[PDB]
Amino acid sequence: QHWSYGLRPG
């Protein structure tokens, strides 16, 4: 995973 999760995309 590497996405705009529950924070910034990173």
Q: Give me 1's structure tokens.
A: 């995973």
DSSP 1-10: --SB-SSSB-
Alpha carbon distance 7, 2 (integer Å): 11
What is the residue whose two structure tokens read 């995973």? 1
Are 7 and 1 within 8 A, CB to CB?
no
What is the residue whose two structure tokens read 């924070």? 7
Are 3 and 10 within 8 A, CB to CB?
no
Alpha carbon distance 10, 4 (integer Å): 7
Are 3 and 9 within 8 A, CB to CB?
yes
Q: Please give the method by which this entry was determined.
A: NMR
Q: Give me 8's structure tokens.
A: 């910034």
Burial code (b: 16+ CB inside 10 Å, e: under 16) for 1-10 equals eeeeeeeeee
Alpha carbon distance 10, 6 (integer Å): 10
